[PDB]
Design a protein around this ligand. Structure first.
Ligand code: ANP
Ligand code: ANP
Ligand code: MG
Ligand code: MG
Length: 1118
């Protein structure tokens, strides 16, 4: 465990405006806290002048009443509004600083101790925790502490002995608070770690959603999510028990102190030290102070959790990169020529330090000559590029640029002078114009068009209906395989480099397109040096020099609450128990007041023996009620917290199931992206937990207190005015809370922050891409621009919450003061008695304090309405393609494999103007392989997407074994289909689990057999941990050939009747490609295949050869 930061450390992001907002909020909280005890003492001093003509007194007291009401209104408004706005400002600044600190970390930091889900969780949940600490909760804590201090001061003014003996309660409260905060901080640390793991599971599931549904992995993902959430719910159970114990102990100590105060006051009255009224005022003040201490628990609860979260964030924020770019003092060579050398480079990756990738590696790329880096799969090559880009510093060697060590000069102008086309083109979620513009932000439109033209990208871009502004793709999945690669080539070529690195730039392209791109590059590489990694002889022939790499060298209720209750029925037992506890607790509060007020009339009896006996009896009653309050506070808090934990866990499971049940058209939307979906789920769960589950107990307790106050008013026959004043707080609280909830339940602008979260997710998922193009500052600027609208919306919400709290406080104070005036007027005139009114008004004060505690929950209700609307909008949505229709034609156990497409007319939901298929009739024979060929955008992968019902054809019929796939069970039919994705990314797990993802249960021997049949066993066994090696966030800690061989092994261990396959032989050496192709041909004999090929030599015995020309039925015979 890591120790949390100091409380002061929470305020390192405050500026002058934040300081003045915090000061105004603190002044308002202090004045609001002192308003009540000074008001009571002022009435005590006002009684005499009220008894003592009348019109002048009434007018003066009315104007003083108006002044005090205005002061209370302003103070209670500021205490909420200023604190909310200041907390939001500091939280936004801290999020921006966290993103900026994370973005300029080393590359080795992102495959070691941070993931994309980790940063998303830090931006969302930990930041909300820190905000809740520095938001209006701090203002409430200051208000309660001011109330306690004011009560002690006025008690000291009235009776100094009683105030002094009251002052002995603070050490016990301090000890209880310290113990409770320590336990809560540790439990919250563990719970937050578990929740981060669960969020990682969710994000990884959504990112690879096509692979997840293709291999029927929704159930496994849901089970893993539930298993992760079980730990969090157990820690929540423990947290609720700890909170119950703390609140019970605090109430027990406060009530025992009350009884001791009562007995000591009786002793003082026995002598001639103090009279009745002074003890009355002191009892009132001490009661208010104890109630304030009781209500100040949620602030202390949030403080420790947010201290832990802020420690977690500040660990990343204060972390300094080990590369240590020499931005202040670098060489900054002026006229770079192009001579780049690797001299005696000994390099081993930080993730696997034992494996030495390069030993004594020497390679001199000349000033203006091209080097073709031929070599084996998983042997240098892409690592060498990572050395030139300064992704990793060489461990025991040197990298030189024009005879200058790269570590002695800043890497900013390096990456500005290097144009990189990586193995996997990492495209962002913006438009393709912004993706191309990443190379040079300050470029004209004509320059962008020229860069696209030379990179052979203009033809397919101008054909798009939206042109260059086409905003498609999260990982580029809304473009074809070659389109995103050509866009990456255009992006790299726009930034005119002196050194150009092409790590398999051609890779997956059509023959004509590949020739055009390579010729344009050749006429583009005349004056600049280039390092090219390519396993195709076409580029090698044109290359100037060739280097062979071997062995690392060179050779409302109706729609929100009742639906939750129906969903969460099998907890109404626990809730009921907790409910009664809360109710009981509230009763004691009222009851306690009554008892104390009764003692207030015993003090005046001259009979000392009878008075002493009454004092003793009431002291025993108070001790019994104190013990009961202890027990029932513990019970109510523990059970309400277990109810909240069950609520949140069931909500999370239901939301994840709803997300995973949807179709591709849903996932191909800007709102329904992986980082945004994960952030939505996490924020919704956190809001329905903290703002609803943690407030139901206090809501029902205060409601019960107010109702029992009204019931005692009816039983004891109070006047109609008194019961009206008692009822008024209930109506005010109900109206205010309903208004805040409806404000929350109607409208939002969280999508502005959701865009920032998604931008951070893309930036962290593509740290190599953002680093190579020096786009960290651009990402930070876009993040700040996205975060401003949430800042202003939260400003407005804080304004309305402060106004509501202020008006409610003013109404309560006005009602109480008018009641006080009426009661004193009744007593003076003798129309009513005295002791009865005293009990009436003590109970009234307790009820009003409970109502204020209820009113304190406005922002929580607003965010609870937000969360409820979000979760129910997610749940209500119904999918277009149901993953499993119960009433379907059964799938035969031995599927023949007669997959066909008849008159298929298909248009993607996104960009629906383009008609991908116009009357496409493709047929695959039973058990025979079929090859799909054509241009890049002809739709070869669209056929694969149509086979698995990712999207439905508009007017086409896709047929399986002579039966429509629509009338089959989608989950059942998907178990007989095995695919390999076009760009085979892996999950954030081991090789063993990645391969085992293909089949439900496949023990160990089957996994080994699949690995051998994919010719992947050799390198996996050569790894230090074998099949248990962690492969990275998306398989980043592996080469392309190894990743694709692992994907092939997974598709093989699926052992399906219809292996769709694809161009899975790319990114593989000629020998490796031949071995994999021979093994696949041997394994797939007798089973139908729909393999697509870009190199026609691979499909030598593919039987039927089908071309896709004009998106229609082209030649199919051969
Ligand atoms: N971040 C990383 N952590 C650990 N190992 C890594 C990492 N990145 C790459 N490797 C390993 O580096 C080894 C060789 O370097 P690499 O650059 O992947 O080779 P390559 O020859 O370019 N592969 P390929 O493109 O498929 O032909 C592979 O076995 C990888 O598993
Ligand atoms: N989700 C999507 N939304 C919109 N268009 C899409 C989407 N997915 C694919 N496309 C388009 O579908 C067309 C064909 O792409 P694809 O189905 O990958 O064909 P392909 O022939 O397999 N490509 P390639 O591997 O490069 O040869 C392209 O114009 C894509 O931009
Ligand atoms: Mg490579
Ligand atoms: Mg494709």
């Amino acid at each position: 465990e890591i120790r949390g930061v100091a409380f002061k450390e929470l305020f390192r992001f405050a500026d002058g405006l934040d300081y003045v907002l915090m000061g105004i909020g603190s002044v308002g909280a202090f004045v609001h806290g002192c308003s009540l005890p000074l008001f009571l003492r002022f009435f005590a001093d006002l009684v005499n002048s009220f008894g003592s003509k009348m019109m002048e007194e009434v007018l003066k007291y009315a104007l003083y009443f108006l002044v005090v009401g205005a002061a209370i209104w302003a103070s209670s408004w500021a205490e909420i509004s200023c604190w909310m706005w200041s907390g939001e400002r500091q939280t936004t600044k801290m999020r921006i600083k966290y993103l900026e600190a994370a973005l300029n970390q080393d590359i080795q930091f992102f495959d070691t101790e941070v993931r994309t889900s980790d940063v998303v969780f830090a931006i969302n949940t930990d930041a909300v925790m820190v905000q809740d600490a520095i938001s209006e909760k701090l203002g409430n804590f200051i208000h309660y502490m001011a109330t306690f201090v004011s009560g002690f001061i006025v008690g000291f003014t009235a009776v100094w002995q009683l105030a002094l003996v009251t002052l002995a309660v603070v050490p016990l409260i301090a000890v209880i608070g310290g113990i409770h905060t320590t336990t809560l901080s540790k439990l919250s640390n563990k719970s937050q770690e578990s929740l981060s793991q669960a969020g990682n599971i969710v994000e990884q599931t959504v990112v690879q959603i096509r692979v997840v549904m293709a291999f029927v992995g929704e159930s496994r993902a849901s089970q893993a999510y539930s298993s992760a959430l079980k730990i969090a719910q157990k820690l929540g159970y423990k947290t609720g028990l700890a909170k119950g114990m703390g609140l019970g102990a605090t109430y027990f100590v406060v009530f025992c102190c009350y009884a001791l105060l009562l007995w000591y006051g009786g002793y003082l009255v026995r002598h001639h030290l103090t009279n009745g009224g002074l003890a009355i005022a002191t009892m009132f003040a001490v009661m208010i102070g104890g109630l304030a201490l009781g209500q100040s628990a949620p602030s202390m609860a949030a403080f420790a959790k947010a201290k832990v979260a802020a420690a977690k964030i500040f660990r990343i924020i204060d972390h300094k990169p080990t590369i240590e770019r020499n931005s202040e003092s670098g060489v900054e060579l002026d006229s770079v020529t192009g001579l780049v050398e690797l001299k005696n480079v000994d390099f081993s990756y930080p993730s696997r330090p034992d494996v030495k990738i390069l030993n004594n590696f020497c390679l001199s790329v000349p000033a203006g000559k091209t080097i073709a880096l031929v070599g084996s799969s998983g042997s240098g090559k892409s690592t060498v590029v990572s050395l030139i880009e300064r992704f990793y510093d060489p461990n025991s060697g040197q990298v030189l640029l024009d005879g200058q060590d790269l570590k002695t000069l800043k890497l900013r102008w390096l990456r500005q002078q290097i144009g990189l086309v990586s193995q996997e083109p990492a495209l962002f979620a913006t438009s393709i114009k912004e993706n191309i513009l990443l190379g040079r932000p300050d470029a004209d439109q004509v320059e962008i068009e020229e860069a696209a033209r030379v990179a052979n990208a203009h033809s397919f871009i101008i054909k798009l209906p939206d042109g260059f502004d086409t905003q498609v793709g999260e990982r580029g999945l809304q473009l074809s395989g070659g389109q995103k690669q050509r866009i990456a080539i255009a992006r790299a070529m726009l930034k005119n480099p002196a050194i150009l690195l092409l790590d398999e730039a051609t890779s997956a392209l059509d023959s004509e397109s590949e020739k055009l791109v390579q010729e344009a590059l050749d006429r583009f590489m005349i004056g600049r040096t280039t390092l090219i990694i390519a396993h195709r002889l076409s580029t090698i022939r044109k290359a100037d020099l060739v280097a062979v790499l071997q062995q690392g060298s060179v050779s409302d209720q109706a729609n929100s609450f009742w639906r939750l209750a129906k969903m969460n029925s099998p907890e109404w037992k626990y809730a009921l128990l907790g409910s009664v506890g809360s109710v009981i607790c509230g009763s004691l509060s009222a009851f306690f007041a009554y008892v104390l007020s009764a003692v207030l009339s015993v003090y005046y009896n001259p009979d000392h023996e009878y008075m002493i006996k009454q004092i003793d009896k009431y002291c025993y009653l108070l001790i019994g009620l104190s013990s009961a309050a202890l027990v029932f506070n513990t019970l109510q808090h523990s059970f309400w917290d277990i109810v909240g934990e069950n609520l949140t866990k069931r909500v999370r499971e239901k939301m994840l199931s709803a997300v995973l049940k949807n179709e591709m058209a849903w996932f191909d939307q800007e709102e329904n992206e992986s980082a945004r979906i994960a952030a939505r789920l996490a924020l919704d769960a956190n809001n329905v937990r903290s703002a609803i589950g943690d407030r139901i107990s206090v809501i029902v307790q205060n409601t019960a207190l107010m109702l029992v106050a009204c019931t005692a008013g009816f039983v004891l026959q109070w006047r109609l005015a008194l019961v009206l004043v008692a009822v008024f707080p209930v109506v005010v609280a109900a109206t205010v809370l309903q208004k805040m909830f409806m404000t929350g339940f109607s409208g939002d602008l969280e999508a502005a922050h959701a865009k920032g979260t998604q931008l951070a997710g893309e930036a962290i998922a593509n740290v190599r891409t953002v680093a190579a193009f020096n786009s960290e500052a651009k990402i930070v600027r876009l993040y700040t621009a996205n975060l401003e609208p949430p800042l202003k919306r939260c400003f407005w919400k804080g304004q309305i919450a402060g106004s509501g709290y202020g008006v409610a406080q003013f109404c309560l104070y006005a009602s109480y003061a008018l009641g006080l005036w009426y009661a004193s007027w009744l007593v003076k005139h003798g129309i009513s008695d005295f002791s009865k009114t005293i009990r009436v008004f003590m109970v009234l004060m307790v009820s009003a304090n409970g109502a204020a505690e209820t009113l304190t929950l406005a922002p929580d209700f607003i965010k609870g309405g937000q969360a409820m609307r979000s979760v129910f909008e997610l749940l209500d949505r119904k999918t277009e393609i149901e993953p499993d229709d119960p009433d379907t034609t059964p799938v035969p156990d031995r599927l023949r494999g007669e997959v066909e497409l008849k008159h298929i007319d298909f248009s993607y939901p996104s960009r629906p103007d383009i008609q991908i298929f116009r009357d496409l009739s493709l047929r695959a024979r039973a058990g025979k392989t079929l090859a799909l060929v054509g241009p890049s955008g002809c739709g070869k992968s669209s056929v694969i997407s149509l086979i698995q019902r990712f999207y439905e054809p508009s007017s086409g019929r896709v047929m399986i074994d002579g039966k429509d796939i629509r009338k089959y069970n989608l989950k059942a039919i998907r178990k007989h289909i095995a695919i390999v994705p076009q760009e085979p990314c892996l999950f954030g797990t081991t090789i063993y689990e990645n391969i085992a993802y293909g089949h439900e249960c496949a023990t160990e021997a089957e996994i080994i057999q699949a690995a051998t049949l994919a010719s992947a066993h050799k390198f996996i066994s050569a790894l230090p941990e074998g099949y248990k090696t962690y492969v990275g966030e998306r398989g980043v800690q592996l080469s392309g050939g190894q990743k694709q061989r692992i994907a092939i092994a997974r598709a093989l261990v699926r052992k399906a009747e219809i292996m769709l396959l694809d161009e899975a032989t790319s990114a593989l050496d000629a020998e490796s490609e031949r071995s994999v192709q021979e093994a696949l041909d041997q394994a797939c004999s007798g089973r139908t295949s729909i393999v697509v090929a870009h190199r026609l030599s691979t499909i030598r015995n593919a039987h039927v050869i089908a071309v896709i020309d004009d998106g229609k039925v082209a030649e199919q015979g051969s």
